[PDB]
């Protein structure tokens, strides 16, 4: 990230503003609302500063910039129209390892002053890095049209109850479950807004009275095929609240960037499923919200049922969040719909990597008016070409291979069935093989890109 | 306002973390990502720190907290389990006027770390006071769901173009209206993400050349099978930016309640397909962002392809957001995995204007999933038995899969016909050995 947002406690900390015009005024206002001990150093001051100075809210130092005025400061702001002065200020601040904002020069400073949405104690800060004030001036408006009006009063009440919640609930999990119920009680929000303390307290006492479930849970979450935007809403909720997210190589890096930062991430890509099961098992037996994050959909060649049968055996709760399976994601992002008109009346999702014993039912797979989708079939692509041809599928059946479907690295190669073995040599795992007439739709429906 | 949020440029700035456990590793990850020149000081280090240190990404100092390690720091983080140490760090940073965070005591020092939505250079930070973090999580999660993850590339490119937009749009209102189109333009965002420097320029000139009123494009969005939680993030993001949403009855009311309040809504449910197609281009050529919301996934028995063909020949930009098809939705919510071990080598999604292959449908080691097959269900039981499928083959009908009205009836194929009329549209018929797994995997209840 370009910047690290921090929320500074400025009470009783010296800050210096250099400059005395309307810009310094706006910054001085913010720093005063944060309770900073403020010194303003400028040649001239607009009348608001003398008003603030007369009320003892800051110190004016009339004159050119005084480097020494930084010696005890925690923040500095150069807010003059003189870029030469502003650089002297920045330089002085740098030597003293003081964070410094140059208002007219966001990239030149150290810190940047974001747009603020004040719903004290709830604070939301927005900045497009100062390079684009428009989006800050605009996303701030969007967020302001997002946060409920009385979110501050709910958050204020939450702060008043924090001590009591910490006393009555020993573990982080319990407190989290209380907070979850607390923040979605609409009646409580409204009783807070109405200053209806009878109602506040009734709802509150019942809240604390509720037994909390202490069981861990394992949620199987379909990551989707790679594009972070194809995680479902519920899947995002699950990984934004997980304590442990167990994931493999088929969960994209962009999906993993939506896993809350406080989650423990456990990589189980290359292991024996018997050890995965017990990793899920052990962490859920510890009471934690465990997410098994899997590429695609958990129940399509996912080994997902296998983990769950052991959790069920161990009395561990679990749910499943479906995901966009590789077939749907590749379909949408390659412009190859899995069904169309009468191109295809059925879709077959088939594994290539089959159990050591036995092979596929190739006569069955060679049936017309199907779209075939082979999962992990790359190494068997030649065998699939051979078999499909040999059980009667037309030699010129369009085939497409989608590598890293839905990601920026998506690559599509396509051709006819007789090219399948050769096409698969051009892509790598992870790749889907689509066989069927719908592949010819790519040329009218491809909206994504060409690698 | 009890905290001043500031966004720190930490690249090449000495920052100190004290602690070497899981908490410190999370702060250290964050500070590494922000570019901090990082020293970590701890009695011991979990192996992730020795990995980062071998890679020269930070400096480890093993042993008691050394106050002099702060001598040139900009930021300090007390990330130990030891209150005594954290206060030693906090006091030593306070005396040196180094902003300092005590992870487990947000009121104990000079800054707290907010929840971050990172879309660099666009960043949103939310905090309401630390330790628990639920309110911040709820806002963060909601914002994570509303801010496309590439939006930072859009924001970066905007700052480059800021000079060009002014010397074309004279009034700030015009500039403002331009910027609103700019930041929601899908093809710009996907071109930037895909590094397609061709499609960027094309999309930029189109944004500068086409009228400030035109934003005409159709997005095919898969609503998923019913549960509003099964909409994708992109789907949510698309229906929030829609000027007009075209939907039918297979899009749940819950999905429809996610729709931007000022959007026009066009119901095309019970309407032959040609009139729907016409509606979509008719709206897209009026310069409006059109979302066609379709139940499940748009490209699975949705006629999604046919809608886009009308548009592609008309020069109207479009995209497709895939959805949770009924099969996978119902599978997850009925505890019937479509595949499992050696039960089924393949899954077949099949509909209920031609013919249907029965001996093919009857073959072993498949999971059959019939869409729109409730009317043809008596035939289904007859034909599959008549083509060799064993009598005891488990069958299930899943009606209103993933909704709070979901009903699952299950038995064997020999009861399938009677099980069918016991259920109404919209419903899937699932046939296969995986159906028996519902006893141990049914969690939806
Ligand atoms: N992004 C992607 N692009 C193409 N194929 C993918 C893919 N992600 C997963 N796959 C396919 O899925 C196989 C793994 S099997 C697990 C698939 C997952 N459960 C799903 O529902 O999609 C890989 O061998 C590959 O064929
Ligand atoms: N919630 C649901 N539960 C069970 N079946 C559903 C369903 N929603 C849609 N269907 C099935 O889908 C059929 C319409 S065909 C449209 C399917 C959609 N494009 C998808 O991908 O799921 C219905 O007849 C019904 O059998």
CSV table of N, CA and C in Angstrom, one decimal, chain A residues 1-9 11 13 33 74 94 110-112 114 118 123-125 127-129 131-135 138 146 166 179-180 228-229 231-234 236 240 254 257 261-262 264 299 301 309 312 318 320 323-324 331 338-341 345-349 351 360 364 370 408 444 447-448, chain B residues 1-9 11 13 26 33 94 110-112 114 116 118 120-121 123-128 131-132 137 140-142 144 149 155-156 162 176 179 183 190 193 227-229 231-234 299 301 305-306 309 312 318 320 323-324 331 338-339 341 345-349 360 363 440 443:
chain,number,residue,atom,x,y,z
A,1,UNK,N,0.8,-1.2,0.0
A,1,UNK,CA,0.0,0.0,0.0
A,1,UNK,C,0.9,1.3,0.0
A,2,UNK,N,0.3,2.3,-0.6
A,2,UNK,CA,1.1,3.5,-0.8
A,2,UNK,C,1.2,4.2,0.6
A,3,UNK,N,0.2,4.1,1.4
A,3,UNK,CA,0.1,4.8,2.7
A,3,UNK,C,-0.4,3.8,3.7
A,4,UNK,N,0.1,4.0,5.0
A,4,UNK,CA,-0.5,3.3,6.1
A,4,UNK,C,-1.4,4.2,6.8
A,5,UNK,N,-2.7,4.0,6.8
A,5,UNK,CA,-3.6,4.8,7.7
A,5,UNK,C,-3.4,4.4,9.1
A,6,UNK,N,-3.2,5.4,9.9
A,6,UNK,CA,-3.2,5.3,11.4
A,6,UNK,C,-4.1,6.4,11.9
A,7,UNK,N,-4.8,6.1,13.0
A,7,UNK,CA,-5.6,7.0,13.7
A,7,UNK,C,-4.8,7.5,14.9
A,8,UNK,N,-4.3,8.7,14.8
A,8,UNK,CA,-3.4,9.3,15.9
A,8,UNK,C,-4.2,9.9,17.0
A,9,UNK,N,-3.8,9.7,18.2
A,9,UNK,CA,-4.3,10.4,19.4
A,9,UNK,C,-3.4,11.7,19.5
A,11,UNK,N,-4.3,14.5,21.4
A,11,UNK,CA,-4.5,15.2,22.7
A,11,UNK,C,-3.1,15.5,23.3
A,13,UNK,N,-0.5,16.8,22.2
A,13,UNK,CA,0.7,16.6,21.4
A,13,UNK,C,0.9,17.9,20.6
A,33,UNK,N,-10.0,20.0,16.5
A,33,UNK,CA,-11.0,19.0,16.8
A,33,UNK,C,-10.4,17.7,17.3
A,74,UNK,N,4.9,16.5,17.0
A,74,UNK,CA,4.5,15.1,16.6
A,74,UNK,C,4.0,15.1,15.1
A,94,UNK,N,11.7,16.2,8.5
A,94,UNK,CA,12.3,15.0,8.1
A,94,UNK,C,13.5,14.7,9.1
A,110,UNK,N,5.3,13.4,4.1
A,110,UNK,CA,5.3,12.0,4.6
A,110,UNK,C,3.9,11.6,4.7
A,111,UNK,N,3.1,12.3,5.5
A,111,UNK,CA,1.7,11.9,5.6
A,111,UNK,C,0.8,12.8,4.8
A,112,UNK,N,-0.4,12.2,4.5
A,112,UNK,CA,-1.5,12.8,3.7
A,112,UNK,C,-2.7,12.9,4.7
A,114,UNK,N,-6.5,12.6,5.0
A,114,UNK,CA,-7.6,12.1,4.3
A,114,UNK,C,-8.9,12.8,4.5
A,118,UNK,N,-16.9,11.7,10.2
A,118,UNK,CA,-16.9,11.8,11.6
A,118,UNK,C,-18.2,11.3,12.1
A,123,UNK,N,-15.0,6.4,13.1
A,123,UNK,CA,-14.3,7.3,12.2
A,123,UNK,C,-14.1,6.5,10.9
A,124,UNK,N,-14.3,7.1,9.7
A,124,UNK,CA,-14.0,6.6,8.4
A,124,UNK,C,-13.1,7.6,7.7
A,125,UNK,N,-12.0,7.2,7.2
A,125,UNK,CA,-11.1,8.1,6.5
A,125,UNK,C,-10.9,7.6,5.0
A,127,UNK,N,-8.9,8.5,1.3
A,127,UNK,CA,-8.0,9.3,0.4
A,127,UNK,C,-7.7,8.5,-0.8
A,128,UNK,N,-7.7,9.1,-2.0
A,128,UNK,CA,-7.2,8.6,-3.2
A,128,UNK,C,-5.7,9.0,-3.3
A,129,UNK,N,-5.0,9.1,-2.2
A,129,UNK,CA,-3.6,9.4,-2.2
A,129,UNK,C,-3.3,10.9,-2.6
A,131,UNK,N,-3.5,12.3,-5.2
A,131,UNK,CA,-3.4,12.4,-6.6
A,131,UNK,C,-4.7,12.7,-7.3
A,132,UNK,N,-5.8,12.2,-6.7
A,132,UNK,CA,-7.2,12.4,-7.1
A,132,UNK,C,-8.0,12.9,-6.0
A,133,UNK,N,-8.1,14.2,-5.8
A,133,UNK,CA,-9.1,14.8,-4.8
A,133,UNK,C,-10.5,14.5,-5.2
A,134,UNK,N,-10.8,14.3,-6.5
A,134,UNK,CA,-12.2,14.2,-6.9
A,134,UNK,C,-12.8,13.0,-6.3
A,135,UNK,N,-12.2,11.8,-6.3
A,135,UNK,CA,-12.8,10.6,-5.8
A,135,UNK,C,-12.9,10.7,-4.3
A,138,UNK,N,-15.7,12.4,-3.3
A,138,UNK,CA,-16.9,11.8,-3.9
A,138,UNK,C,-17.2,10.4,-3.4
A,146,UNK,N,-24.0,5.7,3.1
A,146,UNK,CA,-23.9,4.3,3.4
A,146,UNK,C,-24.1,4.0,4.8
A,166,UNK,N,-16.3,-6.9,28.4
A,166,UNK,CA,-15.0,-7.6,28.7
A,166,UNK,C,-15.1,-8.3,30.1
A,179,UNK,N,-21.0,-8.8,20.3
A,179,UNK,CA,-21.0,-7.6,19.5
A,179,UNK,C,-21.8,-7.8,18.2
A,180,UNK,N,-21.7,-9.0,17.6
A,180,UNK,CA,-22.5,-9.2,16.4
A,180,UNK,C,-23.9,-9.0,16.6
A,228,UNK,N,-11.4,-12.0,-7.8
A,228,UNK,CA,-11.9,-11.7,-6.5
A,228,UNK,C,-13.4,-11.3,-6.5
A,229,UNK,N,-13.8,-10.6,-7.6
A,229,UNK,CA,-15.2,-10.1,-7.6
A,229,UNK,C,-16.2,-11.3,-7.7
A,231,UNK,N,-16.2,-14.0,-5.8
A,231,UNK,CA,-16.6,-14.5,-4.5
A,231,UNK,C,-18.1,-14.1,-4.2
A,232,UNK,N,-18.9,-15.0,-3.6
A,232,UNK,CA,-20.2,-14.6,-3.3
A,232,UNK,C,-20.2,-13.6,-2.1
A,233,UNK,N,-21.3,-12.9,-1.9
A,233,UNK,CA,-21.5,-12.1,-0.8
A,233,UNK,C,-21.3,-12.8,0.5
A,234,UNK,N,-21.9,-14.0,0.6
A,234,UNK,CA,-21.8,-14.8,1.8
A,234,UNK,C,-20.4,-15.3,2.0
A,236,UNK,N,-17.7,-13.9,1.2
A,236,UNK,CA,-16.9,-12.8,1.7
A,236,UNK,C,-17.2,-12.5,3.2
A,240,UNK,N,-14.2,-12.6,5.8
A,240,UNK,CA,-14.0,-11.4,6.6
A,240,UNK,C,-14.2,-11.6,8.1
A,254,UNK,N,-5.9,-12.8,-5.2
A,254,UNK,CA,-6.9,-11.8,-5.0
A,254,UNK,C,-8.0,-12.2,-4.0
A,257,UNK,N,-6.6,-11.9,-0.6
A,257,UNK,CA,-6.5,-10.5,-0.1
A,257,UNK,C,-7.8,-10.0,0.5
A,261,UNK,N,-7.3,-9.5,7.8
A,261,UNK,CA,-5.9,-9.6,8.2
A,261,UNK,C,-5.7,-10.3,9.5
A,262,UNK,N,-6.7,-10.4,10.4
A,262,UNK,CA,-6.5,-11.1,11.6
A,262,UNK,C,-6.8,-12.6,11.6
A,264,UNK,N,-5.8,-16.4,10.7
A,264,UNK,CA,-4.7,-17.3,10.5
A,264,UNK,C,-4.9,-18.0,9.2
A,299,UNK,N,-18.3,-28.5,-3.9
A,299,UNK,CA,-19.0,-29.8,-4.1
A,299,UNK,C,-18.8,-30.2,-5.6
A,301,UNK,N,-16.0,-31.7,-7.7
A,301,UNK,CA,-14.6,-32.2,-7.7
A,301,UNK,C,-13.8,-31.6,-6.6
A,309,UNK,N,-17.9,-35.2,6.2
A,309,UNK,CA,-18.4,-36.4,6.8
A,309,UNK,C,-17.6,-36.6,8.1
A,312,UNK,N,-19.0,-33.9,10.8
A,312,UNK,CA,-20.3,-34.4,11.2
A,312,UNK,C,-20.1,-35.6,12.2
A,318,UNK,N,-21.2,-27.2,10.6
A,318,UNK,CA,-20.6,-26.8,9.4
A,318,UNK,C,-21.7,-26.4,8.5
A,320,UNK,N,-22.0,-24.9,4.1
A,320,UNK,CA,-21.3,-24.9,2.8
A,320,UNK,C,-21.8,-23.6,2.1
A,323,UNK,N,-19.7,-21.8,-4.6
A,323,UNK,CA,-18.9,-20.8,-5.3
A,323,UNK,C,-19.2,-21.0,-6.8
A,324,UNK,N,-18.8,-20.0,-7.6
A,324,UNK,CA,-18.8,-20.0,-9.0
A,324,UNK,C,-17.8,-21.1,-9.4
A,331,UNK,N,-16.7,-20.1,-18.5
A,331,UNK,CA,-17.7,-19.8,-19.5
A,331,UNK,C,-18.0,-18.3,-19.7
A,338,UNK,N,-22.3,-22.2,-21.5
A,338,UNK,CA,-22.3,-23.7,-21.4
A,338,UNK,C,-23.5,-24.3,-22.1
A,339,UNK,N,-24.6,-23.5,-22.2
A,339,UNK,CA,-25.8,-23.9,-23.0
A,339,UNK,C,-26.1,-22.8,-23.9
A,340,UNK,N,-26.7,-23.1,-25.0
A,340,UNK,CA,-27.2,-22.1,-25.9
A,340,UNK,C,-28.2,-22.7,-26.9
A,341,UNK,N,-29.3,-22.0,-27.2
A,341,UNK,CA,-30.2,-22.5,-28.2
A,341,UNK,C,-30.4,-24.0,-28.2
A,345,UNK,N,-27.9,-29.0,-25.0
A,345,UNK,CA,-29.1,-29.2,-24.1
A,345,UNK,C,-28.6,-29.7,-22.7
A,346,UNK,N,-27.4,-30.2,-22.6
A,346,UNK,CA,-26.9,-30.7,-21.3
A,346,UNK,C,-25.4,-30.2,-21.2
A,347,UNK,N,-25.0,-30.1,-20.0
A,347,UNK,CA,-23.6,-29.8,-19.6
A,347,UNK,C,-23.1,-30.9,-18.8
A,348,UNK,N,-21.9,-31.4,-19.1
A,348,UNK,CA,-21.2,-32.4,-18.3
A,348,UNK,C,-20.0,-31.8,-17.7
A,349,UNK,N,-19.9,-31.9,-16.4
A,349,UNK,CA,-18.7,-31.6,-15.7
A,349,UNK,C,-18.1,-32.9,-15.3
A,351,UNK,N,-14.4,-35.2,-14.4
A,351,UNK,CA,-13.0,-35.2,-14.0
A,351,UNK,C,-12.2,-35.9,-15.0
A,360,UNK,N,-13.2,-43.5,-17.7
A,360,UNK,CA,-14.4,-42.8,-18.0
A,360,UNK,C,-15.3,-43.6,-18.9
A,364,UNK,N,-20.6,-42.6,-23.3
A,364,UNK,CA,-21.6,-41.6,-22.7
A,364,UNK,C,-21.1,-40.2,-23.0
A,370,UNK,N,-24.2,-31.9,-26.2
A,370,UNK,CA,-23.7,-31.7,-24.9
A,370,UNK,C,-22.6,-30.7,-24.9
A,408,UNK,N,-6.5,-12.0,-14.4
A,408,UNK,CA,-5.8,-11.2,-15.4
A,408,UNK,C,-4.9,-12.0,-16.2
A,444,UNK,N,-18.4,-14.1,-30.8
A,444,UNK,CA,-19.5,-13.0,-30.6
A,444,UNK,C,-19.6,-12.6,-29.2
A,447,UNK,N,-16.0,-10.7,-24.2
A,447,UNK,CA,-15.9,-9.4,-23.7
A,447,UNK,C,-14.7,-9.1,-22.8
A,448,UNK,N,-14.0,-10.2,-22.4
A,448,UNK,CA,-12.9,-10.0,-21.3
A,448,UNK,C,-11.6,-9.5,-21.9
B,1,UNK,N,-14.2,14.3,17.6
B,1,UNK,CA,-13.1,13.5,16.9
B,1,UNK,C,-12.0,13.3,17.8
B,2,UNK,N,-11.9,12.0,18.3
B,2,UNK,CA,-10.9,11.6,19.2
B,2,UNK,C,-9.5,11.1,18.6
B,3,UNK,N,-9.6,10.8,17.4
B,3,UNK,CA,-8.3,10.4,16.6
B,3,UNK,C,-8.3,11.2,15.3
B,4,UNK,N,-7.1,11.7,15.0
B,4,UNK,CA,-6.9,12.3,13.7
B,4,UNK,C,-6.4,11.1,12.7
B,5,UNK,N,-7.3,10.7,11.8
B,5,UNK,CA,-6.7,9.7,10.8
B,5,UNK,C,-5.8,10.5,9.9
B,6,UNK,N,-4.6,9.9,9.8
B,6,UNK,CA,-3.6,10.4,8.8
B,6,UNK,C,-3.1,9.1,8.0
B,7,UNK,N,-2.7,9.4,6.8
B,7,UNK,CA,-2.2,8.3,5.9
B,7,UNK,C,-0.7,8.5,5.8
B,8,UNK,N,0.1,7.6,6.4
B,8,UNK,CA,1.5,7.8,6.5
B,8,UNK,C,2.3,7.2,5.3
B,9,UNK,N,3.2,7.9,4.7
B,9,UNK,CA,4.2,7.4,3.8
B,9,UNK,C,5.3,6.8,4.6
B,11,UNK,N,7.4,4.2,3.4
B,11,UNK,CA,8.5,3.7,2.5
B,11,UNK,C,9.8,4.2,3.0
B,13,UNK,N,11.0,4.3,6.0
B,13,UNK,CA,11.1,4.8,7.3
B,13,UNK,C,11.3,3.7,8.3
B,26,UNK,N,1.1,-10.0,12.1
B,26,UNK,CA,0.1,-9.3,11.3
B,26,UNK,C,0.4,-7.8,11.2
B,33,UNK,N,4.0,-4.3,3.8
B,33,UNK,CA,3.2,-3.9,2.7
B,33,UNK,C,3.2,-2.4,2.5
B,94,UNK,N,6.8,7.4,23.6
B,94,UNK,CA,6.2,8.6,24.0
B,94,UNK,C,7.3,9.7,24.2
B,110,UNK,N,-0.4,6.3,21.3
B,110,UNK,CA,-0.7,7.5,20.5
B,110,UNK,C,-1.3,7.2,19.1
B,111,UNK,N,-1.4,5.9,18.7
B,111,UNK,CA,-2.2,5.7,17.5
B,111,UNK,C,-2.8,4.3,17.6
B,112,UNK,N,-3.9,4.1,16.9
B,112,UNK,CA,-4.6,2.8,16.8
B,112,UNK,C,-4.5,2.5,15.3
B,114,UNK,N,-6.5,1.3,12.2
B,114,UNK,CA,-7.9,1.1,11.8
B,114,UNK,C,-8.1,-0.2,10.9
B,116,UNK,N,-8.6,-1.5,7.4
B,116,UNK,CA,-8.2,-0.9,6.1
B,116,UNK,C,-8.9,-1.6,5.0
B,118,UNK,N,-8.0,-1.6,1.3
B,118,UNK,CA,-6.8,-1.2,0.5
B,118,UNK,C,-7.2,-1.3,-1.0
B,120,UNK,N,-5.1,0.8,-3.1
B,120,UNK,CA,-4.0,1.8,-3.3
B,120,UNK,C,-4.0,2.3,-4.8
B,121,UNK,N,-3.9,3.6,-5.0
B,121,UNK,CA,-3.7,4.6,-4.0
B,121,UNK,C,-5.0,5.0,-3.3
B,123,UNK,N,-7.6,4.5,-0.5
B,123,UNK,CA,-7.6,3.8,0.8
B,123,UNK,C,-8.8,4.3,1.6
B,124,UNK,N,-9.4,3.4,2.3
B,124,UNK,CA,-10.5,3.7,3.3
B,124,UNK,C,-10.0,3.0,4.6
B,125,UNK,N,-10.2,3.8,5.7
B,125,UNK,CA,-9.8,3.3,7.0
B,125,UNK,C,-11.0,3.5,7.9
B,126,UNK,N,-11.3,2.5,8.6
B,126,UNK,CA,-12.5,2.5,9.6
B,126,UNK,C,-12.0,2.1,10.9
B,127,UNK,N,-12.4,2.9,11.9
B,127,UNK,CA,-12.1,2.4,13.3
B,127,UNK,C,-13.2,3.0,14.2
B,128,UNK,N,-13.5,2.3,15.3
B,128,UNK,CA,-14.4,2.8,16.3
B,128,UNK,C,-13.8,2.5,17.7
B,131,UNK,N,-9.4,-3.6,20.0
B,131,UNK,CA,-9.6,-4.9,20.6
B,131,UNK,C,-10.6,-5.8,19.9
B,132,UNK,N,-11.9,-5.5,19.9
B,132,UNK,CA,-12.9,-6.4,19.4
B,132,UNK,C,-13.0,-6.3,17.8
B,137,UNK,N,-15.3,-4.4,11.3
B,137,UNK,CA,-15.4,-5.5,10.4
B,137,UNK,C,-16.7,-5.4,9.6
B,140,UNK,N,-16.1,-2.7,7.2
B,140,UNK,CA,-15.0,-3.1,6.3
B,140,UNK,C,-15.6,-4.2,5.3
B,141,UNK,N,-16.3,-5.2,5.8
B,141,UNK,CA,-16.8,-6.2,4.9
B,141,UNK,C,-17.7,-5.6,3.9
B,142,UNK,N,-18.6,-4.7,4.3
B,142,UNK,CA,-19.5,-4.1,3.4
B,142,UNK,C,-18.8,-3.3,2.3
B,144,UNK,N,-15.5,-3.7,1.4
B,144,UNK,CA,-14.8,-4.7,0.6
B,144,UNK,C,-15.8,-5.3,-0.5
B,149,UNK,N,-11.9,-4.6,-6.6
B,149,UNK,CA,-10.5,-4.7,-6.1
B,149,UNK,C,-9.5,-4.0,-7.0
B,155,UNK,N,-8.2,4.7,-10.0
B,155,UNK,CA,-7.9,5.9,-9.2
B,155,UNK,C,-6.5,6.5,-9.7
B,156,UNK,N,-5.6,5.6,-9.8
B,156,UNK,CA,-4.3,6.0,-10.3
B,156,UNK,C,-4.3,6.7,-11.6
B,162,UNK,N,-6.2,14.1,-14.9
B,162,UNK,CA,-6.8,15.2,-14.3
B,162,UNK,C,-6.6,16.5,-15.1
B,176,UNK,N,-17.3,16.8,-12.7
B,176,UNK,CA,-17.9,15.8,-11.7
B,176,UNK,C,-18.6,14.7,-12.5
B,179,UNK,N,-16.3,12.3,-14.0
B,179,UNK,CA,-15.6,11.4,-13.1
B,179,UNK,C,-16.5,10.3,-12.6
B,183,UNK,N,-15.3,6.4,-13.0
B,183,UNK,CA,-15.0,5.5,-12.0
B,183,UNK,C,-15.9,4.2,-11.9
B,190,UNK,N,-11.5,-3.0,-16.3
B,190,UNK,CA,-11.0,-4.3,-16.7
B,190,UNK,C,-9.8,-4.2,-17.7
B,193,UNK,N,-6.9,-3.3,-15.3
B,193,UNK,CA,-6.5,-4.6,-14.6
B,193,UNK,C,-5.8,-5.5,-15.6
B,227,UNK,N,-30.9,-17.2,-2.7
B,227,UNK,CA,-30.3,-16.5,-1.6
B,227,UNK,C,-29.5,-15.3,-2.0
B,228,UNK,N,-29.9,-14.2,-1.4
B,228,UNK,CA,-29.2,-12.9,-1.8
B,228,UNK,C,-27.7,-13.0,-1.5
B,229,UNK,N,-27.3,-13.8,-0.4
B,229,UNK,CA,-25.9,-14.0,-0.2
B,229,UNK,C,-25.1,-14.7,-1.3
B,231,UNK,N,-25.3,-13.9,-4.5
B,231,UNK,CA,-24.8,-12.9,-5.5
B,231,UNK,C,-23.3,-12.7,-5.4
B,232,UNK,N,-22.6,-12.5,-6.5
B,232,UNK,CA,-21.2,-12.3,-6.4
B,232,UNK,C,-21.0,-10.8,-6.0
B,233,UNK,N,-19.7,-10.5,-5.6
B,233,UNK,CA,-19.4,-9.1,-5.3
B,233,UNK,C,-19.6,-8.2,-6.5
B,234,UNK,N,-19.1,-8.6,-7.7
B,234,UNK,CA,-19.2,-7.9,-8.9
B,234,UNK,C,-20.7,-7.8,-9.3
B,299,UNK,N,-25.5,-18.2,-18.2
B,299,UNK,CA,-25.1,-19.1,-19.3
B,299,UNK,C,-25.4,-20.5,-19.1
B,301,UNK,N,-28.8,-22.6,-19.2
B,301,UNK,CA,-30.2,-22.6,-19.4
B,301,UNK,C,-30.9,-21.3,-19.2
B,305,UNK,N,-26.8,-16.2,-23.7
B,305,UNK,CA,-26.1,-16.0,-24.9
B,305,UNK,C,-26.9,-15.3,-26.0
B,306,UNK,N,-28.2,-15.6,-26.1
B,306,UNK,CA,-29.1,-15.0,-27.1
B,306,UNK,C,-29.3,-13.5,-26.9
B,309,UNK,N,-26.2,-11.6,-28.2
B,309,UNK,CA,-26.0,-11.5,-29.6
B,309,UNK,C,-26.7,-10.3,-30.2
B,312,UNK,N,-24.1,-7.5,-29.3
B,312,UNK,CA,-22.8,-7.4,-30.0
B,312,UNK,C,-22.9,-6.9,-31.4
B,318,UNK,N,-20.9,-4.8,-23.5
B,318,UNK,CA,-21.5,-5.7,-22.5
B,318,UNK,C,-20.5,-6.5,-21.8
B,320,UNK,N,-20.5,-10.1,-18.7
B,320,UNK,CA,-21.2,-11.1,-18.1
B,320,UNK,C,-20.6,-11.3,-16.7
B,323,UNK,N,-23.0,-16.5,-12.2
B,323,UNK,CA,-23.8,-16.7,-11.1
B,323,UNK,C,-23.7,-18.1,-10.6
B,324,UNK,N,-24.2,-18.3,-9.3
B,324,UNK,CA,-24.3,-19.7,-8.8
B,324,UNK,C,-25.5,-20.3,-9.5
B,331,UNK,N,-27.1,-28.0,-4.5
B,331,UNK,CA,-26.2,-29.0,-3.9
B,331,UNK,C,-25.7,-28.6,-2.6
B,338,UNK,N,-22.5,-32.6,-5.6
B,338,UNK,CA,-22.7,-33.1,-7.0
B,338,UNK,C,-21.7,-34.2,-7.3
B,339,UNK,N,-20.5,-34.1,-6.7
B,339,UNK,CA,-19.5,-35.2,-6.8
B,339,UNK,C,-19.1,-35.6,-5.4
B,341,UNK,N,-15.9,-38.5,-4.0
B,341,UNK,CA,-15.1,-39.8,-4.1
B,341,UNK,C,-15.4,-40.4,-5.4
B,345,UNK,N,-18.3,-39.9,-11.6
B,345,UNK,CA,-17.2,-39.3,-12.4
B,345,UNK,C,-17.6,-38.0,-13.1
B,346,UNK,N,-18.9,-37.8,-13.2
B,346,UNK,CA,-19.4,-36.6,-13.9
B,346,UNK,C,-20.7,-36.1,-13.4
B,347,UNK,N,-21.0,-34.9,-13.5
B,347,UNK,CA,-22.3,-34.3,-13.2
B,347,UNK,C,-22.9,-33.8,-14.5
B,348,UNK,N,-24.2,-34.1,-14.7
B,348,UNK,CA,-24.9,-33.7,-15.9
B,348,UNK,C,-26.0,-32.7,-15.5
B,349,UNK,N,-25.9,-31.5,-16.1
B,349,UNK,CA,-26.9,-30.5,-16.0
B,349,UNK,C,-27.7,-30.6,-17.3
B,360,UNK,N,-28.2,-42.8,-22.4
B,360,UNK,CA,-27.1,-42.0,-22.0
B,360,UNK,C,-27.4,-41.4,-20.6
B,363,UNK,N,-26.7,-44.0,-17.3
B,363,UNK,CA,-25.5,-44.7,-17.1
B,363,UNK,C,-24.9,-44.5,-15.7
B,440,UNK,N,-25.9,-37.0,6.2
B,440,UNK,CA,-24.8,-36.6,7.0
B,440,UNK,C,-24.3,-35.2,6.6
B,443,UNK,N,-26.9,-29.5,6.3
B,443,UNK,CA,-26.7,-28.4,7.3
B,443,UNK,C,-27.8,-27.4,7.3
